[PDB]
Curated annotation (Swiss-Prot), chains A, B, C, D:
Cited SUPFAM superfamilies: Inosine monophosphate dehydrogenase (IMPDH)
Post-translational modification: Ubiquitinated leading to its degradation by the proteasome. The N-terminus is blocked.
Organism: Homo sapiens (Human)
Pathway given in the UniProt record: Purine metabolism; XMP biosynthesis via de novo pathway; XMP from IMP: step 1/1
Glycyl lysine isopeptide (Lys-Gly) (interchain with G-Cter in SUMO2), cross-linked positions: K300
Modified residues (Phosphotyrosine): Y278
Membership in a protein family: Belongs to the IMPDH/GMPR family.
PANTHER family in alphabetical order: INOSINE-5'-MONOPHOSPHATE DEHYDROGENASE 2, INOSINE-5-MONOPHOSPHATE DEHYDROGENASE RELATED
Protein name, per record: Inosine-5'-monophosphate dehydrogenase 2
Residue numbers of N6-acetyllysine PTMs: K373
Subcellular location(s) per record: Cytoplasm; Nucleus; Cytoplasm, Cytosol
Lineage: Eukaryota, Metazoa, Chordata, Craniata, Vertebrata
Class of enzymatic activity (EC top level): oxidoreductase
Function: Catalyzes the conversion of inosine 5'-phosphate (IMP) to xanthosine 5'-phosphate (XMP), the first committed and rate-limiting step in the de novo synthesis of guanine nucleotides, and therefore plays an important role in the regulation of cell growth. Could also have a single-stranded nucleic acid-binding activity and could play a role in RNA and/or DNA metabolism. It may also have a role in the development of malignancy and the growth progression of some tumors.
Amino acid sequence: MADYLISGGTSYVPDDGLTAQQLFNCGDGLTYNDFLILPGYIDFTADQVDLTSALTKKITLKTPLVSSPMDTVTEAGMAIAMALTGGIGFIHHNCTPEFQANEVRKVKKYYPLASKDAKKQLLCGAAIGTHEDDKYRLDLLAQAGVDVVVLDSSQGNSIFQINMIKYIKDKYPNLQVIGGNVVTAAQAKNLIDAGVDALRVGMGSGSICITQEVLACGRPQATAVYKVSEYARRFGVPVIADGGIQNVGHIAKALALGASTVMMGSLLAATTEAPGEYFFSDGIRLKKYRGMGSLDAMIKVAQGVSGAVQDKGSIHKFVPYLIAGIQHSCQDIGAKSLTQVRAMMYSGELKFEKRTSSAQVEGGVHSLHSYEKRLF
Amino acid sequence: MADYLISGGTSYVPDDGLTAQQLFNCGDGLTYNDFLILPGYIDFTADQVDLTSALTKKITLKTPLVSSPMDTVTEAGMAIAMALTGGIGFIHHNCTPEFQANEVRKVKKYYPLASKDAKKQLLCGAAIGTHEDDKYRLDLLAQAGVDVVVLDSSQGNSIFQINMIKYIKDKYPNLQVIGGNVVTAAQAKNLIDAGVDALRVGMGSGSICITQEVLACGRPQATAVYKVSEYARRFGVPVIADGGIQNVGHIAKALALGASTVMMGSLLAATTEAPGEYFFSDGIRLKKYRGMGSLDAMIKVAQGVSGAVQDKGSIHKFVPYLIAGIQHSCQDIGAKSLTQVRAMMYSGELKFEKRTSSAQVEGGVHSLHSYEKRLF
Amino acid sequence: MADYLISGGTSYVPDDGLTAQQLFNCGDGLTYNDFLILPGYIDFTADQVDLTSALTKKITLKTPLVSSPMDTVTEAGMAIAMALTGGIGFIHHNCTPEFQANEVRKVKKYYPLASKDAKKQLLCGAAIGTHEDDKYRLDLLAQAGVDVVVLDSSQGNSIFQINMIKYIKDKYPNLQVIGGNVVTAAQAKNLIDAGVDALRVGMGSGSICITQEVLACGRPQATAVYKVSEYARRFGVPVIADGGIQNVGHIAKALALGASTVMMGSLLAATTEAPGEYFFSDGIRLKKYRGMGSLDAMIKVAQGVSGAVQDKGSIHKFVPYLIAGIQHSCQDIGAKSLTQVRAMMYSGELKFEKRTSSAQVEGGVHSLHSYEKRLF
Amino acid sequence: MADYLISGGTSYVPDDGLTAQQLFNCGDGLTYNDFLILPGYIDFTADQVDLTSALTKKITLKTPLVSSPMDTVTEAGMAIAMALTGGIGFIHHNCTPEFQANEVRKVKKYYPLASKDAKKQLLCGAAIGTHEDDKYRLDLLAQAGVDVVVLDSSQGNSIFQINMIKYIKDKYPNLQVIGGNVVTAAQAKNLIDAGVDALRVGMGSGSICITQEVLACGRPQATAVYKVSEYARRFGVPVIADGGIQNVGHIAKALALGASTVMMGSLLAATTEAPGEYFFSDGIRLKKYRGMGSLDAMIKVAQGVSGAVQDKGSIHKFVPYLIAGIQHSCQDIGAKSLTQVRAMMYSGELKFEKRTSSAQVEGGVHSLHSYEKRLF
Ligand SMILES: NC(=O)c1ccc[n+]([C@@H]2O[C@H](COP(=O)([O-])OP(=O)(O)OC[C@H]3O[C@@H](n4cnc5c(N)ncnc54)[C@H](O)[C@@H]3O)[C@@H](O)[C@H]2O)c1
Ligand SMILES: NC(=O)c1ccc[n+]([C@@H]2O[C@H](COP(=O)([O-])OP(=O)(O)OC[C@H]3O[C@@H](n4cnc5c(N)ncnc54)[C@H](O)[C@@H]3O)[C@@H](O)[C@H]2O)c1
Ligand SMILES: NC(=O)c1ccc[n+]([C@@H]2O[C@H](COP(=O)([O-])OP(=O)(O)OC[C@H]3O[C@@H](n4cnc5c(N)ncnc54)[C@H](O)[C@@H]3O)[C@@H](O)[C@H]2O)c1
Ligand SMILES: NC(=O)c1ccc[n+]([C@@H]2O[C@H](COP(=O)([O-])OP(=O)(O)OC[C@H]3O[C@@H](n4cnc5c(N)ncnc54)[C@H](O)[C@@H]3O)[C@@H](O)[C@H]2O)c1
Ligand SMILES: O=c1[nH]cnc2c1ncn2[C@@H]1O[C@H](COP(=O)(O)O)[C@@H](O)[C@H]1O
Ligand SMILES: O=c1[nH]cnc2c1ncn2[C@@H]1O[C@H](COP(=O)(O)O)[C@@H](O)[C@H]1O
Ligand SMILES: O=c1[nH]cnc2c1ncn2[C@@H]1O[C@H](COP(=O)(O)O)[C@@H](O)[C@H]1O
Ligand SMILES: O=c1[nH]cnc2c1ncn2[C@@H]1O[C@H](COP(=O)(O)O)[C@@H](O)[C@H]1O
């Protein structure tokens, strides 16, 4: 009897570690490789973990991986491919509107967990601009049959973006929009009261964004995804993480801080289904990678740069490594779903820990003469 | 009279420094080269310090140095050698079971402080897997006559490992098991209540483990050895430190934070008794060094890498330098045994101090044009 | 009237900055380039600042610069030279006792502020070992007529060093001894109650000492000079700073934290009056520089290394730059003597400020393509 | 030598106690019997302490005791009396203007330290209202020859009071005004920039004011005198403490927190020179005592009450006890003048200490069956 009715079910479970709530009000600007996740008790293995997540308030996915809408990372090829592996892709807005019209008609008509609708057609998203000339851009791909759109912007709460939500939802109520870019709760309020359906958190944290050093704005991104998902839980709105993703660990860190889908732009760059084409340098196979703020887009200013990244193969051999990396991580946390790991984080059942620079210099590799970092 | 009976024996001993208990609840993730040990009063010299320590609850050793069970660092050669110098070795589990059966029969049959049993045969340990097919692996080396085994696992508290303790101790009660890998108190409870005999603390902190950056799990290791030895003192269970050992100072830091034996994998790599064989690169004598999580072990994922480390000579000329390095350190702390230095740490008689990055950049070498770092 | 008698003399003087007392109990291990000194009101210029300081409780100097007793930095040449510029030199103990006997007889027999005694002979100090065979070393240079000696030791409070003070002061009461190495208050008590005359604070902080990484002992040095001069003010005992001196700013930081004389070993290395001789490497004029813990001194261990430093000219053109660097610093603090700057620090009239790594990366030089760092 | 030039003059002086600056930003609302003053080194005795203080920026007094302008405490009698003992008195404004005109002409025409001007006539102050009909009140006693006036108001920074300063100082520039009532720095700025000459700090803290419980405004008074004298030191403006004075200890606490003169209304009530006349109750000699906010002044509200206090004798036998009580207190602090004790408080040479309720219940009298509290 009394082994049960002193507490009831729960054992002692000592108090070593920091929950996220007292981790992130310390005032430190945390990024991904500055905290990490402490392990706990497991009762399962790596393959029955239900890795489903939500992109908007209605449509949910079999994996939390989404491509970022730039022309140097995704078009209809990787939209097709990431749909067929479970994820979702967007399409950039620096082309003509008929170009993405044809791009969406290519991806829409056209693998067990392939993320298909009630029409059993593959999910497709896109992204539009913010200026009022894009109203003629928007209704064309609305005629093409897009599912979600992303208001790609450097800062979220303009009058322009709020008027675009109040322009879209009273015209196209079944069509669902993504707000962005939101990085605090203060601008997270003005989009949820606008009525937006999900948020896209993170500015200044990309591989190629220098706008933290040019415009002196933004935030560290792992203290941003936490507080935006903290405010956005109050209304049941999922958030989408941008920037600072370099590997598959940061995926799990963004997923355990409240973000439901992780948006990658560099880690999905230099793939077979990425647009453009290859060129060698020092004998290394690579392809170019640039951002919308870079002046290789078109009295200007530049928030992005233009560089290149070495090849990473086809995505159909790449995203199984990423979902297995999320699955082994969610096993070592101790939750057999992403819903359950966000439950354990909001309740405090898993606990984090800070790092120092001396702590991450041991976290990678050290005391070697040379090494061959082979990932899969 | 009254020079004595105001306090009694103890002098004033001013309050400069931080004891470990208020050092490690600051929430900072400390590693070894981020704190250090402040000196105190000595009354002895470097050679009568009784450097004995405990590996499990029954068998104790003349030195706290133990090799790590990987095939790229130890087999029966360095098992023989480190037994004959005082320490203990394990044997990896990525071979056939008859291979370690012959390996244990080679080391068991076969220098004053040579760590021998009541049969006056040398101590030998090993390590097994976790899956239930390893039951046929376990009883074969139990027939060979192993002393301790290590449940080598990335995370400790599975159902599988707890069922292995409850499978072993009711079959082989004199045989003693090592749990692992434990890194918090929360999983330190589920192995001690399972009935495990010692713990192996530290994940993600090796020279070649990238699982802090791949699976986003683990902990900084010097804030891990402290809290696991804090919880494991409550039941009288010693702990074993893994990873992040680069030199002989980190040995003393792990020993002064409550760990009783320090397990090394890279600092004992590239020795004469390490298996494999040498090959030059840039004219530097070196040999390869890889981990079990690396995919040079055999829909996969990789937590380790495969590299190489330059040669460090025979261990019989190497571990006297390591035990003399522990002895000079234990002299400069002010305790003539490791039992007494852990006593002084749990009571608060020695005190630590944090460092900054600017503090360790002076701690090594600086303001030189070139230097020849000669260790012994 | 009432402009005076509300406070009395003192103006408002706002409360921006941190005094040393609340700076150094934060628990951070501060080194020299991690804090700096905030300026205040001046009423003088750089040349009438009385830069006199104290070495022991009796003999005081016209400058706080003292050479460190190693054979690779000082002998009777730089003893003569630094005496003739104001400072004091010691003589290493890794030679035969007749060698320093002749060395002290060379420097003693033999420029306005030349630090001469009541005999009007130049001041000379030395250093002896700790073992009891050095009693025959000690009385020989006592016969030679040395002024102060330094008990050169890695850690201060042995029984051996305390018995050496109780062996010296009852035999040679006018002869004055230097304790060392002390780094906390806890060992600062056992030498002052032994009756030592000054302290030599700092271990593990040299340019060539690796004993923080080998023996895991020591302390960050700018949090060491503060607390040792804090405890040693209570008995009126000056302290001497070792290690971590790279330039002339760290001189002023050690002098403003309570240390009265700054002992340099690398910044006075590679000079004309340093012993040994020159040799080129890559066409750079340089000479070797090694420590007593390095195994180029003679079952061993090594706490120092052996390297080299590029040439810095004659000291008679070098220490005027150092005393002018202390003078401009003491001008910018706002105290026309070193006694007054330690008064302003113990009272709280000057205030410090922490730095971050991002703060010192701007403190040096940045945003240049190349630069020519010319010091004087 | 070196007993001096390590610090310079000052001895160690340990760090027990709290200076006022870190006492009063704790956020606690301190009153007088909630902190107290720790003693220090003395070098004098109780009678040569120069107890002079300042009332305005020009005229200074031989004692810091000033009566409060109510009709139930002071008129021309106690104005004459407290002038002749050193202090200064004001005259209430709830009479006709010709009444205080005659009152000031009685006190002005008319004992060694008797506070007389360059005309060798006794100092006299008064107080006027705030409404614009009081301009005819003001010039009449300006014709009578008053020295200072007090803008008696519940809250200080009205437009009305600032316009009264800008009405007075451009008409009557030699005439000096007192602002009030100020209780924070926020309203202390708007009167000093108005150009007021001293402040009268404290609202809601009187013996008879209930405006903290009626209007929910004010502040605890000993955390008010500190921060108003903190802001008013920046412009060299003295402040005057009201309310919460019950004895002679609170005088010393208000004087050691930066206030230069202490204004009493109840402790100078029930004296021989107080107006009105006596009446017995329970056989106890007493006289009535009421405030301006009480509706025994004339759609109303009431901030004061109307009561009575028992007799305390003539003031010429009473204020020598008060100045001897300030003198013994200033002796036990360790400053031979009030200017020097405010110097020691702003520099931090004296230190305070908080109390608890359990700490003041021992501070008075306890463990007695009865006691006869005889004051002088
Ligand atoms: N982490 C991120 O996602 C991130 C962060 C920063 C920048 N960026 C990229 O930078 C790109 C361009 O940045 P941008 O916001 O400066 O250009 P934009 O086209 O995205 O936004 C338009 C610019 O003009 C303003 N604007 C919006 N509507 C306007 C209207 N009717 N009239 C006049 N001005 C209007 C906006 O403030 C903005 O500066 C974006 O497409 C985005 O992809 C991305
Ligand atoms: N610091 C360290 O010591 C450390 C840290 C991380 C990884 N590693 C190395 O990584 C190696 C492999 O890591 P690993 O744990 O992923 O492989 P493993 O063979 O050690 O463990 C088996 C894997 O499958 C799961 N498992 C256990 N029993 C199972 C069963 N009956 N059925 C199905 N699944 C079961 C486990 O969770 C684990 O992921 C380990 O041998 C270890 O040496 C070491
Ligand atoms: N910052 C510094 O100044 C610093 C710090 C560390 C080391 N060092 C250098 O390192 C040198 C050598 O270091 P060390 O202290 O190990 O050698 P040492 O000769 O200075 O001291 C003797 C060693 O044996 C022990 N000892 C002392 N008296 C003994 C006795 N009668 N019998 C037996 N043992 C005795 C001491 O603990 C010490 O380890 C020192 O000369 C010092 O210059 C300097
Ligand atoms: N600790 C203290 O000293 C203290 C604190 C509170 C109240 N009091 C006493 O309370 C007495 C009355 O308090 P009070 O301030 O309410 O009355 P008041 O006569 O002192 O002030 C006039 C009142 O009307 C307002 N006022 C000022 N000028 C005005 C103007 N031209 N036209 C219209 N309104 C104007 C003021 O806000 C105030 O409420 C005061 O005389 C004061 O002595 C003293
Ligand atoms: O030009 C740019 N300037 C700033 N941010 C950009 C730019 N282009 C793309 N981004 C953002 O950077 C993210 C990709 O960052 P990554 O994870 O480092 O690849 C995208 O999802 C966008 O939100
Ligand atoms: O492949 C791996 N991935 C993660 N950790 C490993 C791996 N192989 C060995 N380890 C751990 O790393 C430790 C050695 O770390 P080292 O002290 O840096 O050499 C071993 O004791 C193991 O616990
Ligand atoms: O061999 C050694 N090991 C550790 N410390 C040394 C050694 N030799 C000299 N030192 C100390 O290092 C100081 C010089 O440090 P520097 O200021 O970096 O040159 C000397 O004053 C000695 O106290
Ligand atoms: O009627 C009133 N209501 C609120 N405060 C008053 C009143 N009358 C006088 N005061 C203030 O109370 C102070 C006297 O407080 P005491 O020190 O307790 O006697 C005077 O100096 C006035 O500032």
